[PDB]
DNA sequence: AGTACGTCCCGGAAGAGATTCA
DNA sequence: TGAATCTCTTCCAGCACACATCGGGACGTACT
RNA sequence: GCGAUGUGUG
């Protein structure tokens, strides 16, 4: 239900968000809640409510990313071992209907429209794990099974 | 203002100044009459547009899931993040169309300026409420968290001006009851702490 | 004997009336409701009262409201005193009848005794040092305590129906005590931290906000005015908008 | 910890008047712990000045 | 179409969803429960019947004798509700019981000697229930809450985390019966299964296993499957199963048919599994060392000498292998262990076992149960037999058995009450599977495991406890049984039963004090649901989630109505449409769904039943055909909302209302409000207080009508008919001939309870709301109750309110009110205080009830009668005297007006101990009630005769009519009225025999009631005569009350003010109340604004109609106008016409309107801005709902036009002149010479520990020293102080705190010396 | 007849087992 | 052999109000 | 003229 594999750039970005929050946004909201609580001190005061709620959320996320920075394992490998599509690969797949579909595969904690937004613990990935330029990949979605053809493998 | 007044002219003038502050305040406050009316909370025209776009995005991610591109976990996570982004967009929209909408001639043609919509007034004043509360009046009221400390995959579409559909209100219910209940136990343990401290010093 | 000393410490306690373990000497000492926590680190006190509170913003914050009936009942000693000073009743008993009848002269004497005699106010959740302050009453109709608005936030006390209690120093030294260390004047800053504690709040600040904010164009636009006096003059006349860009002389 | 420094204080009547009675009073009673006042809670109890 | 009465004020309503199932009878829980508790039901099935069939028959010590139940009856009570409340005794009822008492045929097979069935011996009395669902213990009207407790059954909890720090989850299981002893299982990080009975200690569960007379071998066979080693020619091949491999990774040789299939250093593949299973190869050679990590299953012995080689539960070694080999064995049973599928849990447990037999097992059990005492074989035998295997001291109800098996995936919905071997076994299996990962723990708070009891269950259970009390002494005295010279009542004593039930209904965390200070209050508090009480969790021990609300309270428990403060969630209010299942769970309604149609078929559901379906939320736009207009729709499936497909749904909401409480449903525009203030408003609305003049809340909801009707405060006509006699005291109605009885029905009489006492000292009163000669429909109101109008719920009043800060006087929430209000009295509440004066004949003599009190003045002498009592109706101020009582010696003992209360006296009751001379006024009031009851029964029989002769006349309309020969003779000369051969002659013969019958009957009734009132009712010991006096202040209003709307907008009315100074409008009217706008956004409850706007609309419609009427314009205009009015709106269920109304009718409707066209609104299907706007545009008010105003002071125009409308506000009980209170110098407590606490006791405040802290914090010292020494403790110094004051010498002398002196003497009482010293 | 007067009664934390590396 | 690590079991859980009910039964008698 | 339990207020 989890895999600590990480890409270097994503790890960099994680450190980046970590610093951005615990160094810039937390102190801003800090000053904010302080001035808001300059003896306002009202439970009903939904300003204080929402502010502390932003606090709760940012704290949950910082603890999450903290435990991540702890456990997460980086593999920033070269394009050296190629052919196999084990991980970190720009890949295109096609359908009977010709559904072109391109993406690079990265770690769970990198799923955003930023660079490349396909998991590794995903079923698609599990199929894509070890195949070659011309294999017949198959999966079993909760809607049933399906298949695709490999069309591209690229590294960086 | 008051504070510097103190630190620079001592005490007696400070206090007399404070009471004069209060007098003149209440006076011109009443004389003004800052009410609040329903029409005084503008629904952002683009709100319907944005939340519809968000709906379409949800559908896109749902297609990705059903096509097996993602597991329910990151499904959940993607959805929540995108709703949050949408929420922030809506907040920006409403704050703009409130704080600036007042646009009037000058003996020239036009110009924008800080508003007089009483609710934004009551906020920017700093009397009570802020961007946060005026948000939960005009825009969506974001997301609510089940007792698990988790967070539900379908946010509050509407706001307080419009009517909440039942399930929504029902959710936000426990959302708030959590803390409203918390405060009791909290008070208790706090008092115990206080007592202990007093009898160490 | 074990029961006598500490019922409930050795095996099954022995019960009393029907099923509830009877109190013991140990009980009479320890616990939330033993002698220590019940009657010594705090206790009930004469010369006091309590009511509900309201606002009455016409009060130089070195004072506060107080209910007439309530006062007259409070200071009865002082009343008897000034009474037989002026010699309107030989015996104390006669003066008791006097007060009960509530005759005219009584009220004047009451005002007299109050004029400069600070009293103490308290709220229930007496958290911190502010939690008790003092004032000089001014006698008011009705039956509630009028209370300066600013001091609310110090009391952490909205007007949702909160009850406040009043005490009255009986002795002279204590009158000095109040007037020296308990008269809100002498507390603009929480000993906790440096912030002021006389911060205005919602209404008054809404007021000032509306009171100082330019529009772009309104009655009396950009005229010129020597005296802020005459400014207020314009405003009361209505011959010129309240908030309006303007050049004025000031000092 | 406070919940201790309370107990082992020079005085006792304070402790006696804090968080529990029996432990403290007994240990005193065997200690013959003659006790001055030199303390708020103390004088408050005896009600003289502070 | 509508009822005639309804038409009087046809409340318009918004709303879209066609309501399909009306609101049920809101007292369902109470009435159903109690009715079920008491009825002669056959076949047992949960009643007194059930309790009996459980307890009886009681048998002797086989002493040829026995006693058994037969039947039982309940005689009509000895009083009625009303007079009962007046007097004080409970509203109990007799309990007759028929018992067959038999003695077996001694010295013979089982037979009989003689039997006796006692003539329904009565075993004391228990209460009935009010038709309105209350109880009456002691001159009061109390209620029983219903409890919500962990349902008996079996459960599986985590206790994740916080134990052992191991970062390892745990798993425990629990069985709790309905009446017995808890039984739990759990684990320790060493993975060891422990049982505990009733939380005493811990034991190795296998202990109780072996306790169930099992053999180690069987136990192992049960908890584990087999692994077979066959000792072949050699090499001892193992039997294998492929599925036994996927949870494995074997790194050694794995071969078959010669071929290796998993090499040494590999893992298992599902492909390996499939190949093998297709091959079906089980007998395979194995490495000899593989056995090393295995454990024997059965026992094996030396076949030659029968001698033991190895016992079960024993690991394996090569030496063991050789020894068993040479012995000659060939089959080896071992345990299929694992680290993911199956763990050695039971085995290692059995290892940890100290004992190895049934005997010492029972020994250890008895040792944990009764410590210290020596063991005894048969003793412990019987003990363990008396913990899970007997009717007496252990039982689940059917409820238990059901939920139990349902958890265990069993089949039979029914079963025994006792446990089984199989039961405990399967429980353990479930727990083990859970440990293994398959299966799921069950969160406690999921309502599917909470259960609702009710008064019924409570009474049943406690009455059972009473019977088990009695049976003990029953069998005791049966032991000494002699030959028939006795009767069962000799061998039975009601007194314990009575005592038990008495204590229950008197003192409980449930038998509490009804808040009859508002019809709405009653109807709420009769539905309150608590997790407190016996068997229920407790505040201090209360956890966290239990308080929180679970996603399945939905539509079964209000999410929002609950008091804040020292406890929340624990008092969950009960949902509106909710009901109680046969088995006793929160059952809720839903709408059945076909393929694609929302059929009107209602259908109830449990909690768990819901989870397996999918449910469509209420506000879902359907189209006339049961078809949703969408294809994806918001729904909920399992504690999770989502969007699902069209044809997936199963059931739909019933009505939007169905997810709040009455205590909430009455919150207009709830939807536009946060939960926090929503709650607080609901509560405060509960704390409402009636007024002098009910006034039909403008902006209502729709639930009101129902609330009023159910809450029996008002009076609904049983039958329907026509008004005959109205009177502010009573109302009497003729019935239509159809609904008449099959004969001789007559008419109906409704006595109206007039001004009298609440339970919160708040006037309760009734007022007729009909007129002479008027139709009434069955099931309709006749007289409004307190805070009710025209059969609708009216808590506060409507008022013209405006939002603008005004000279600060609304600083925080300081609601400012205008003298206009206090003019119209339109908050003038009415209170009543029940003051008691009694005497007791004691040493130094009895006492007096006379005016013979010396040392008084004519002031007191006057208002009292000559007989010693205040006259009815004296305006008495404080210090006055109501009754004259004296201490013979003979000082005063008078009962006097408690200080500070003004008011007047309405009535005086006087009870007296039978056997004392009734004084002059006693006789006077005696005769007063006498004559009044006589006149009452005279009304009864006289107008009964009136209806009787009118019915005879109605019979003589046809058939044998003799008009003149009928009216010449007086209306009684009718013994042989000449009639035809129809049944009308037989009818008149019926009425004539009834004439004579009723003559004698009324006679006996009169005389009986005479004796009733004449007797001197039993009372306390030594008491002489009760004289209760009622007073009635008219507390008006004054700065310091607590008003609020219905959205938490609390307020303390701050400064009343004169008409001038209020803001007003160009049209001219003043306004009435000013709230604070700066309170709106923060407490994010925008609703009150909407309410206000829609009101402004309402009163606009009003003023418009009022003008139209004052013009005396003819009807046509009114028709057009009101028709337009109701017609506006997008779509409504409220499509009313006007045409079918009569001219006279409509006019009356308008006249009821003129105060304002009342709009209601369903809780979520309610109206919207656009329709509000259009209603306004119908009126003549500005669209925005903001107007120019004018400060009377300034007499000029405010800027930024503001909001004025009508808000519906309420007053609370927290009246100032109750709260406000002071003390200078009064009483002093007796133990500690300290002041007293409270107001009633004329005591002072409490300077608290934290305040001591405070004053300490200030350098202020003399303050605190004075305020601990003088003001409280020293009597000596206190007096010195008071004197020195009277001489102005502001001074003090401390002395010593007498309380501390007391501490000293107390500790000194303890075995401790403590002293002061020198200086 | 029936009784008013008789006796008759969840977290912490620290201690004593008690268990395990020697 | 003895110093660590479980494990029963005593002690405390805010402040101030307001109001409400209820407070022994049982067993046995010298009379009332 | 005490204490228990409950309810409600902040
Ligand atoms: Mg408050």
PDB file of C-alpha atoms in Angstrom, chain E residues 1015-1122:
ATOM      1  CA  UNK E1015     -61.749  13.062  54.219  1.00  0.00           C
ATOM      2  CA  UNK E1016     -58.494  14.325  55.679  1.00  0.00           C
ATOM      3  CA  UNK E1017     -55.777  12.935  53.461  1.00  0.00           C
ATOM      4  CA  UNK E1018     -52.958  10.874  54.913  1.00  0.00           C
ATOM      5  CA  UNK E1019     -49.753  12.849  55.268  1.00  0.00           C
ATOM      6  CA  UNK E1020     -46.429  12.963  57.051  1.00  0.00           C
ATOM      7  CA  UNK E1021     -46.106  11.795  60.640  1.00  0.00           C
ATOM      8  CA  UNK E1022     -46.633  14.466  63.252  1.00  0.00           C
ATOM      9  CA  UNK E1023     -47.909  16.893  60.630  1.00  0.00           C
ATOM     10  CA  UNK E1024     -51.092  18.762  61.493  1.00  0.00           C
ATOM     11  CA  UNK E1025     -52.443  20.578  58.446  1.00  0.00           C
ATOM     12  CA  UNK E1026     -51.009  21.720  55.132  1.00  0.00           C
ATOM     13  CA  UNK E1027     -51.836  25.232  53.995  1.00  0.00           C
ATOM     14  CA  UNK E1028     -50.416  25.934  50.560  1.00  0.00           C
ATOM     15  CA  UNK E1029     -50.822  29.405  49.113  1.00  0.00           C
ATOM     16  CA  UNK E1030     -50.189  30.389  45.521  1.00  0.00           C
ATOM     17  CA  UNK E1031     -48.900  33.794  44.453  1.00  0.00           C
ATOM     18  CA  UNK E1032     -48.715  35.335  41.004  1.00  0.00           C
ATOM     19  CA  UNK E1033     -46.338  38.140  40.194  1.00  0.00           C
ATOM     20  CA  UNK E1034     -46.650  39.984  36.918  1.00  0.00           C
ATOM     21  CA  UNK E1035     -42.953  40.436  36.162  1.00  0.00           C
ATOM     22  CA  UNK E1036     -42.952  42.838  33.302  1.00  0.00           C
ATOM     23  CA  UNK E1037     -39.581  43.451  31.647  1.00  0.00           C
ATOM     24  CA  UNK E1038     -36.635  45.626  32.589  1.00  0.00           C
ATOM     25  CA  UNK E1039     -33.033  46.042  31.603  1.00  0.00           C
ATOM     26  CA  UNK E1040     -31.297  42.804  32.323  1.00  0.00           C
ATOM     27  CA  UNK E1041     -33.466  40.126  30.835  1.00  0.00           C
ATOM     28  CA  UNK E1042     -32.260  37.792  28.115  1.00  0.00           C
ATOM     29  CA  UNK E1043     -34.050  37.943  24.795  1.00  0.00           C
ATOM     30  CA  UNK E1044     -32.944  36.207  21.654  1.00  0.00           C
ATOM     31  CA  UNK E1045     -34.129  35.313  18.217  1.00  0.00           C
ATOM     32  CA  UNK E1046     -33.964  31.780  16.926  1.00  0.00           C
ATOM     33  CA  UNK E1047     -30.457  31.873  15.637  1.00  0.00           C
ATOM     34  CA  UNK E1048     -28.415  32.210  18.766  1.00  0.00           C
ATOM     35  CA  UNK E1049     -28.543  35.987  18.580  1.00  0.00           C
ATOM     36  CA  UNK E1050     -28.706  36.176  22.325  1.00  0.00           C
ATOM     37  CA  UNK E1051     -29.104  39.484  24.009  1.00  0.00           C
ATOM     38  CA  UNK E1052     -29.274  41.309  27.290  1.00  0.00           C
ATOM     39  CA  UNK E1053     -31.896  43.989  27.042  1.00  0.00           C
ATOM     40  CA  UNK E1054     -29.805  46.955  28.049  1.00  0.00           C
ATOM     41  CA  UNK E1055     -31.653  50.259  28.307  1.00  0.00           C
ATOM     42  CA  UNK E1056     -35.340  50.711  27.752  1.00  0.00           C
ATOM     43  CA  UNK E1057     -35.897  53.967  25.918  1.00  0.00           C
ATOM     44  CA  UNK E1058     -38.722  56.281  24.918  1.00  0.00           C
ATOM     45  CA  UNK E1059     -40.621  56.270  21.651  1.00  0.00           C
ATOM     46  CA  UNK E1060     -38.898  59.392  20.378  1.00  0.00           C
ATOM     47  CA  UNK E1061     -35.374  58.140  20.491  1.00  0.00           C
ATOM     48  CA  UNK E1062     -35.974  55.169  18.270  1.00  0.00           C
ATOM     49  CA  UNK E1063     -35.069  55.318  14.616  1.00  0.00           C
ATOM     50  CA  UNK E1064     -38.082  55.623  12.356  1.00  0.00           C
ATOM     51  CA  UNK E1065     -39.165  55.832   8.731  1.00  0.00           C
ATOM     52  CA  UNK E1066     -40.521  58.457   6.390  1.00  0.00           C
ATOM     53  CA  UNK E1067     -43.845  56.660   6.489  1.00  0.00           C
ATOM     54  CA  UNK E1068     -43.903  57.473  10.165  1.00  0.00           C
ATOM     55  CA  UNK E1069     -43.923  54.397  12.358  1.00  0.00           C
ATOM     56  CA  UNK E1070     -41.196  53.944  14.915  1.00  0.00           C
ATOM     57  CA  UNK E1071     -39.188  50.794  15.154  1.00  0.00           C
ATOM     58  CA  UNK E1072     -39.134  48.586  18.182  1.00  0.00           C
ATOM     59  CA  UNK E1073     -35.865  46.756  18.666  1.00  0.00           C
ATOM     60  CA  UNK E1074     -32.301  47.291  17.587  1.00  0.00           C
ATOM     61  CA  UNK E1075     -29.810  44.441  17.418  1.00  0.00           C
ATOM     62  CA  UNK E1076     -26.132  44.757  16.529  1.00  0.00           C
ATOM     63  CA  UNK E1077     -24.974  44.224  12.962  1.00  0.00           C
ATOM     64  CA  UNK E1078     -21.548  43.595  14.175  1.00  0.00           C
ATOM     65  CA  UNK E1079     -22.776  40.375  15.510  1.00  0.00           C
ATOM     66  CA  UNK E1080     -23.965  38.992  12.206  1.00  0.00           C
ATOM     67  CA  UNK E1081     -20.877  37.949  10.227  1.00  0.00           C
ATOM     68  CA  UNK E1082     -18.782  36.728  13.133  1.00  0.00           C
ATOM     69  CA  UNK E1083     -21.350  34.285  14.386  1.00  0.00           C
ATOM     70  CA  UNK E1084     -21.684  33.095  10.854  1.00  0.00           C
ATOM     71  CA  UNK E1085     -25.475  32.790  10.991  1.00  0.00           C
ATOM     72  CA  UNK E1086     -26.817  34.873   8.131  1.00  0.00           C
ATOM     73  CA  UNK E1087     -30.282  33.456   8.601  1.00  0.00           C
ATOM     74  CA  UNK E1088     -31.794  36.059  10.874  1.00  0.00           C
ATOM     75  CA  UNK E1089     -31.292  38.519   8.049  1.00  0.00           C
ATOM     76  CA  UNK E1090     -33.363  36.441   5.658  1.00  0.00           C
ATOM     77  CA  UNK E1091     -35.971  35.908   8.313  1.00  0.00           C
ATOM     78  CA  UNK E1092     -36.133  39.626   8.805  1.00  0.00           C
ATOM     79  CA  UNK E1093     -36.523  40.420   5.135  1.00  0.00           C
ATOM     80  CA  UNK E1094     -39.235  37.863   4.576  1.00  0.00           C
ATOM     81  CA  UNK E1095     -40.958  39.282   7.580  1.00  0.00           C
ATOM     82  CA  UNK E1096     -40.832  42.822   6.266  1.00  0.00           C
ATOM     83  CA  UNK E1097     -42.618  41.255   3.353  1.00  0.00           C
ATOM     84  CA  UNK E1098     -45.136  39.618   5.639  1.00  0.00           C
ATOM     85  CA  UNK E1099     -46.051  42.735   7.549  1.00  0.00           C
ATOM     86  CA  UNK E1100     -46.190  44.504   4.214  1.00  0.00           C
ATOM     87  CA  UNK E1101     -48.866  42.126   3.005  1.00  0.00           C
ATOM     88  CA  UNK E1102     -50.480  42.799   6.331  1.00  0.00           C
ATOM     89  CA  UNK E1103     -50.532  46.583   6.279  1.00  0.00           C
ATOM     90  CA  UNK E1104     -51.794  46.389   2.717  1.00  0.00           C
ATOM     91  CA  UNK E1105     -54.724  44.172   3.654  1.00  0.00           C
ATOM     92  CA  UNK E1106     -55.368  46.196   6.787  1.00  0.00           C
ATOM     93  CA  UNK E1107     -55.685  49.352   4.734  1.00  0.00           C
ATOM     94  CA  UNK E1108     -57.945  47.571   2.269  1.00  0.00           C
ATOM     95  CA  UNK E1109     -60.205  46.489   5.100  1.00  0.00           C
ATOM     96  CA  UNK E1110     -60.291  49.839   6.880  1.00  0.00           C
ATOM     97  CA  UNK E1111     -61.464  51.250   3.574  1.00  0.00           C
ATOM     98  CA  UNK E1112     -64.391  48.818   3.989  1.00  0.00           C
ATOM     99  CA  UNK E1113     -63.803  47.894   0.373  1.00  0.00           C
ATOM    100  CA  UNK E1114     -66.017  45.048  -0.754  1.00  0.00           C
ATOM    101  CA  UNK E1115     -64.953  41.439  -0.927  1.00  0.00           C
ATOM    102  CA  UNK E1116     -63.973  41.172  -4.586  1.00  0.00           C
ATOM    103  CA  UNK E1117     -60.822  43.205  -4.093  1.00  0.00           C
ATOM    104  CA  UNK E1118     -59.811  41.043  -1.146  1.00  0.00           C
ATOM    105  CA  UNK E1119     -60.391  37.909  -3.165  1.00  0.00           C
ATOM    106  CA  UNK E1120     -58.224  39.144  -6.014  1.00  0.00           C
ATOM    107  CA  UNK E1121     -55.520  40.276  -3.634  1.00  0.00           C
ATOM    108  CA  UNK E1122     -55.207  37.282  -1.330  1.00  0.00           C
TER     109      UNK E1122
END
